[PDB]
Structures are given as structure tokens and as C-alpha cells.
């Protein structure tokens, strides 16, 4: 069973990729009921570059075809307490994102769920929380509110709401 993302223009199947990391922003000003909220990064290309886990492909919110960590998910930040610094998540096992050529790119739901579960586990240990909530982008240009990527010289845009709306106890 898949998480089937709508994308525009339709990416061709040759633009399918491996998801190797992602980049997050922690919601600011939260009273925190033992709860921490994260969204795809509200930062720009510089936030992405500073993670230093990208490969050749230029992409937002998700790193495509980048470097993997060796044994476990690794989360990094230049200052965990600063909500204006993004959080760099590097996967240890990639998540395939397969594009149909007809306007969607699909991800295995069970694999994505298990990846988030691992990311939540590392965040929880960083922030000493219990409940980790992923929520969608709170706004931005099309490149940053969507999962965006340059494939073959053309820019494609996938709504990522389905990837960041879940709770993890």
C-alpha cells in the first residue's frame, strides 16, 4: 500500500528517486504538552546546503539521491533550541519514491511510517519529549511549500501533506 502524492508537471518514471534524508523546522513558541511539532523546513536553499547530505539532485523538504548514514537515522542541528535553525535528518536506509509519468509519485506507506517512527524516536531523545507530531508546510514559495526537485533540467512539485501529518507516541 502506497502514499500516492499528486505532482505537477507529471514527473516521468526516470525521475523516480531514493529518499535519503529530509529537512525540518520545529514549530516555534509551543507551550509543549510533552509535545514537539515539526514541519518540512521553513528555510531556503542555504538551510538545505548546510545539511551537507545532498547529492547532485536539487530538491526541497526531502533529500533525493543523497548520502545515507551507516547504521541508524541521524538527526543534526546547529542549535536544537533555536527554532530558526532547521533540523537535518539523514536516513540510514533510503525510501524509494516512484513516479508514474501520469501526475503522481508514490511511496510505500509502511516504509514511510517506519521511517517517521525512527525519526520521531531520535527527536524524542533529543528533545526529551514524549509525543512527536509532523504537520505540513506552514507556507512558502511553491519550491518550498511542496516537495520540489530538479530532474533532468525540469522542476517538479509534489504536494507533501500526506507525508507530514501524523502523531508518534
Amino acid at each position: 500500500d502506497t502514499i500516492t502524492l499528486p505532482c505537477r508537471p507529471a514527473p516521468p518514471p526516470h525521475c523516480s528517486s531514493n529518499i535519503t534524508g529530509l529537512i525540518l523546522t520545529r514549530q516555534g513558541g509551543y507551550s509543549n504538552a510533552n509535545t514537539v511539532i515539526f514541519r518540512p523546513s521553513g528555510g531556503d536553499w542555504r538551510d538545505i546546503a548546510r545539511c551537507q547530505i545532498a547529492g547532485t539532485v536539487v530538491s526541497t523538504q526531502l533529500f533525493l539521491n543523497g548520502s545515507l548514514a551507516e547504521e541508524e537515522v541521524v538527526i543534526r542541528s546547529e542549535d536544537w533550541r533555536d527554532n530558526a535553525k532547521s533540523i537535518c535528518v539523514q536516513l540510514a536506509t533510503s525510501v524509494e519514491i516512484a513516479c508514474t509519468g501520469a501526475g503522481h509519485c508514490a511511496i510505500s506507506r509502511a516504509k514511510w511510517a517506519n521511517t517517521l517512527k525512527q525519526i520521531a524516536s531520535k527527536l524524542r531523545e533529543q528533545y526529551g519529549a514524549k509525543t512527536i507530531i509532523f504537520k505540513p508546510s506552514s507556507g512558502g514559495d511553491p519550491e518550498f511549500v511542496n516537495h520540489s526537485f530538479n530532474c533532468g533540467g525540469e522542476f517538479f512539485y509534489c504536494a507533501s501533506t500526506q507525508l507530514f501529518a501524523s502523531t508518534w507516541f
Epitope: 523546522t25 516555534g28 513558541g29 523546513s41 521553513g42 528555510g43 531556503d44 536553499w45 542555504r46 538551510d47 546547529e78 542549535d79 533550541r81 533555536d82 527554532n83 530558526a84 535553525k85 532547521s86 508546510s137 506552514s138 507556507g139 512558502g140 514559495d141 519550491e143 518550498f144 511549500v145
Partner: antibody
């Protein structure tokens, strides 16, 4: 020199929305983050959120998440804050202020403030 | 991060020394700033990094502290210093301290 200039005072009925502008100059607009703060009359300062001017991504204070919208127009080096579903609790002075990019601490230059009055 | 700023108000005379403190609910390195605000005026940055004066701020102002406890010190109050002071720790502002004139 560095100059943040905000739009004039606003008067609103409850349930309305307000949009305040912050026009900047004297610096490279995309090199710094922009934050919004407000101050209810006689009360303290509170942070509303920041906006990344290069890409427009935002991080709103949880308290305002869902009814504030921050945007910018880089071509005129201007930031905007729109607050919706206003109630009299939103009466106060609203400030834009500049920080270094990817920082929340040093708000070195501020707008002059915009009074927003929400009343029937 | 939670912040408790003390005292909410104090009164003092021109020339004497006043101390304003800001406590954080966890260690914050020196990620703190102090601002001054006078009635009807815009907040003004005085100190950031907990102890770095902003350029042109007079020498009577200093900040110190690390971890969770931070202090703004005005070594000898001038008349222009009677005003409200706020600490800022990441996105949290302190409750404010108003400095009144003793008479």
C-alpha cells in the same frame, strides 16, 4: 541607513482580518530574517513568527498558527503580516524587526509599530 | 523555553546601581538579548549574546551570566534610563522590568 517602515494604524471589527506592511531599505532584504512582534496596550512583548525572505518559508508561534499569514515581496523589500479572525484580544501595537538569518535573538532594527484596534 | 524576569518593578535614584535578572527554564548558552522601551516608543536593542553591548550603548550597561541565570546591570542610573527592560531568550520575552525614580 537601515530603515523599516510600517503601514498606518488600522481599525477592525471582530472577525475581520488585518494586513500590515513593513517596507525596508538600507540593507539586503534577503540576507536577514524578518520577525513580527506585538504588544497589547500596557502589556509585554510577544513573538508572532519569522519569515525567510529568500524562499518565503515561515515559522509561526503556535499561539498564532492557523490565523496569521506572513509573506514578502522581495522586489520591493517589503514584508507583510496578515492576522485573521480578529477579536479585541488582538488590539495592540504590531512590530516588524530584523534578525540575522536563521536566528531569533538579535532584533537590532525595528519598525515604528502599527496600532491595530479591534472593536465592535 | 520559559523565562522568569525579576523584579517586575523597582525604584532607584539617579546614580545608584540597579540589577535586573532573567532566569531560563534550561541552559541557553548566551543566547539572550536585553532591550529598552520607553512609553510610546519602539523597543531598542542594548545587549545581545548576554554580554555584548550594542555599538554606542553607554558603558554603564553590562550583561553577564551563563547557563540559566542572566543579569542586566546599570552601574549608575542616568535620568534617560528610567524605562522598561525586557530580556529575550530565543523566542521568549521576559515579563519586563520598569525602572522608576525614587523621590
Amino acid at each position: 541607513q537601515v530603515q523599516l517602515v510600517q503601514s498606518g494604524a488600522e481599525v477592525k471589527k471582530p472577525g475581520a482580518s488585518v494586513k500590515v506592511s513593513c517596507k525596508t531599505s538600507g540593507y539586503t532584504f534577503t540576507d536577514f530574517y524578518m520577525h513580527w512582534m506585538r504588544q497589547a496596550p500596557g502589556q509585554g512583548l510577544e513573538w508572532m513568527g519569522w519569515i525567510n525572505p529568500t524562499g518565503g518559508g515561515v515559522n509561526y508561534a503556535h499561539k498564532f498558527q492557523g490565523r496569521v499569514t506572513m509573506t514578502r515581496d522581495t522586489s520591493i523589500s517589503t514584508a507583510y503580516m496578515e492576522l485573521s479572525r480578529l477579536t479585541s484580544d488582538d488590539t495592540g501595537v504590531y512590530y516588524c524587526a530584523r534578525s540575522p538569518a536563521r536566528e531569533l535573538l538579535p532584533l537590532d532594527y525595528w519598525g515604528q509599530g502599527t496600532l491595530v484596534t479591534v472593536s465592535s | 523555553i520559559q523565562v522568569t524576569q525579576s523584579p517586575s518593578s523597582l525604584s532607584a535614584s539617579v546614580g545608584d546601581r540597579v540589577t535586573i535578572t532573567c532566569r531560563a527554564s534550561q541552559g541557553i548558552s548566551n543566547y539572550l538579548a536585553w532591550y529598552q522601551q520607553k512609553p510610546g516608543k519602539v523597543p531598542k536593542l542594548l545587549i545581545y549574546g548576554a554580554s555584548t553591548l550594542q555599538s554606542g550603548v553607554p558603558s554603564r550597561f553590562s550583561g553577564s551570566g551563563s547557563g540559566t541565570d542572566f543579569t542586566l546591570t546599570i552601574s549608575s542610573l542616568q535620568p534617560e534610563d528610567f524605562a522598561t527592560y525586557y530580556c529575550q531568550i530565543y523566542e521568549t520575552f521576559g515579563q519586563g522590568t520598569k525602572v522608576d525614580i525614587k523621590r
